[PDB]
Amino acid sequence: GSGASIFRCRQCGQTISRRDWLLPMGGDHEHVVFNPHGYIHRVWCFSLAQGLRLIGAPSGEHSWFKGYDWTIALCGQCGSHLGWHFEGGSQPQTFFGLIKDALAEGPA
Numbered sequence: 025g026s027g028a029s030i031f032r033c034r035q036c037g038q039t040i041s042r043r044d045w046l047l048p049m050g051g052d053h054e055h056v057v058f059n060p061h062g063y064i065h066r067v068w069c070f071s072l073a074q075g076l077r078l079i080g081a082p083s084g085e086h087s088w089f090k091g092y093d094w095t096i097a098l099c100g101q102c103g104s105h106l107g108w109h110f111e112g113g114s115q116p117q118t119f120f121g122l123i124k125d126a127l128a129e130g131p132a
C-alpha cells in the first residue's frame with residue numbers, strides 16, 4: 025500500500041476519508057462542540073468521505089455550522105454512527121463533520 029494517511033471506521037475498518045480531504049471550515053478542520061445533552065464531540069470536517077449512508081431528513085436544528093442543515097451519517101458497512109453530512113450551504117455546498125473518536129487514522 026501507499027501508507028497515505030487515511031481514516032477508517034473504528035468499528036469495522038472500512039476506509040471513510042483521507043487526511044488530504046480535511047476541510048478547514050471557518051479556519052479549522054477541528055470543531056470541539058456539544059450535542060444538546062452536553063456531551064462533547066471533537067468533530068473533524070472533510071470535503072469528501074466514502075462508505076457512509078445518510079439517515080433521515082436534513083435538519084437545521086442546533087446546527088453547528090451556520091447556514092447548513094445536517095443529516096446523521098452512519099458507516100454503510102456496520103451501521104456505526106460516524107458523524108453528519110452538512111448541506112444547503114454556500115462554499116462548499118456540502119461537507120462531512122465526522123466524530124474523530126469514531127475513526128482511526130492510519131496508513132492506507
Ligand SMILES: O=C1CCN(c2ccc3cc[nH]c3c2)C(=O)N1
Pocket residue numbers: 058059060085086087088089094108
Ligand atoms: O450540527 C449539528 C449536528 C447534529 N447535532 C446533534 C443533534 C441532536 C443530537 C442528539 C444526540 N446527538 C446529537 C447531535 C447537533 O446538535 N448539531
Ligand SMILES: [Zn+2]
Pocket residue numbers: 033034035036037038099100101102103104
Ligand atoms: Zn463501520
